[PDB]
Design a protein around this ligand. Structure first.
Ligand code: NAP
Ligand code: I84
Length: 316
């Protein structure tokens, strides 16, 4: 199938990208270099991951070696919650561009709809442990994001972890200049997101599925949580196609017209995860995979369930 998807800004976004959350600074440079060598042209980053400087080193080296041209790459980053205030958005984007060593981003996303109190702490908590919110609203933050497009800093803007009512809020914003091009959300067989995906696609918004493998290395992974990589039913489907369960889990969202960003710092897995364009899951396989949904969430942002903009109280 097509290796890239058309965005509403006219640009094409590679449907397969490399995730970098939890990728150690001392290993992420080699991971990104190997990914580019193998064919990856889309890298998903974020200032909150604390490794954007090292990711930038890999990108610059490959541009310098002439393995790829800048226009061939699709680099994505995200605005953290403590910079939702209108006057802090540009500076947050500039820090990311400085670390990645690029003069523009192909896509910049609002990481979460929730704004936090500005400061050096990524998760500011009060004397009682709750996250301290900021009195900023999604609409004002969006206007600040639109300004980055007009200034040439980013080619497209989008959102992440927004529920359908929050997406609707932006689409109905008075004076809306640029519609969100992408909504990056958690999606895998245990959290299929049928309703939200249908809603977004019907509005011309491309959906990127994160944690496609169930984020086995998530820090809060409890010793006996569900495990997609070891689900016997998924292993059976992979065996039938002579592919690994990870390849099946990556091919799954692709056939739903979604962009997918598996994360890996292991050279052999980075290469294996890219060999997903040579096989096809049947309609029966897809429907079966969709039946495994349990509404199980890897990223629930539990510390902000009290925030006025917490996205997961709504059904979708
Ligand atoms: N917008 C948001 O709020 C948000 C939230 C969560 C995630 N994300 C993004 O989505 C990306 C992916 O999600 P994620 O990091 O949560 O997890 P993931 O991609 O679902 O899983 C990553 C884990 O799977 C392993 N792995 C990779 N390929 C494998 C293979 N072929 N076989 C067996 N194991 C394999 C990795 O190990 P090794 O690395 O050791 O190989 C790592 O432990 C992120 O890195 C980030 O860019 C964004
Ligand atoms: C428990 C624990 C132990 C060691 C190191 C970190 C943590 C907690 C942790 O990982 N926090 C956290 C960090 C980030 C950076 C995000 S996030 O919002 O950035 N989502 C992940 C992503 O975007 O890939 C979230 C939700 C929680």
């Amino acid at each position: 199938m097509a290796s890239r998807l058309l965005l509403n800004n006219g640009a094409k976004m590679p449907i397969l990208g490399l995730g970098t959350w939890k990728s150690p600074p001392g290993q992420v440079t080699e991971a990104v270099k190997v990914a580019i060598d193998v064919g990856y042209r889309h890298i998903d980053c974020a200032h909150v991951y604390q490794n954007e400087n090292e990711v930038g080193v890999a990108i610059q080296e490959k541009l310098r070696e002439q393995v790829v041209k800048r226009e061939e790459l699709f680099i994505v980053s995200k605005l953290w919650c403590t910079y939702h205030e209108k006057g802090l958005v540009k500076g947050a984007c500039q820090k990311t561009l400085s670390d990645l060593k690029l003069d523009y981003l192909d896509l910049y996303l609002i990481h979460w709809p929730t704004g936090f109190k500005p400061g050096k702490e990524f998760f500011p908590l009060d004397e009682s442990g709750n996250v301290v919110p900021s009195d900023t609203n999604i609409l004002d933050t969006w206007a600040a994001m639109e300004e980055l497009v007009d200034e040439g800093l980013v080619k497209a803007i989008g959102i992440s972890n927004f529920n359908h009512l929050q997406v609707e809020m932006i689409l109905n914003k008075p004076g809306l200049k640029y519609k969100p091009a992408v909504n990056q959300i958690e999606c895998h067989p245990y959290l299929t997101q049928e309703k939200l995906i249908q809603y977004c696609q019907s509005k011309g918004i491309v959906v990127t599925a994160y944690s496609p493998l169930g984020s086995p290395d998530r820090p809060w992974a409890k010793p006996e949580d569900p495990s997609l990589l070891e689900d016997p039913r998924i292993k059976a489907i992979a065996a039938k196609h002579n592919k690994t369960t990870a390849q099946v889990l990556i091919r799954f969202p692709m056939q739903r017209n979604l962009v997918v960003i598996p994360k890996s710092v292991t050279p052999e897995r980075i290469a294996e995860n890219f060999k997903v364009f040579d096989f096809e899951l049947s309609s029966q396989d897809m429907t079966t995979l969709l039946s495994y949904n349990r509404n199980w969430r890897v990223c629930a942002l539990l510390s902000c369930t009290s925030h006025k903009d917490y996205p997961f109280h709504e059904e979708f």
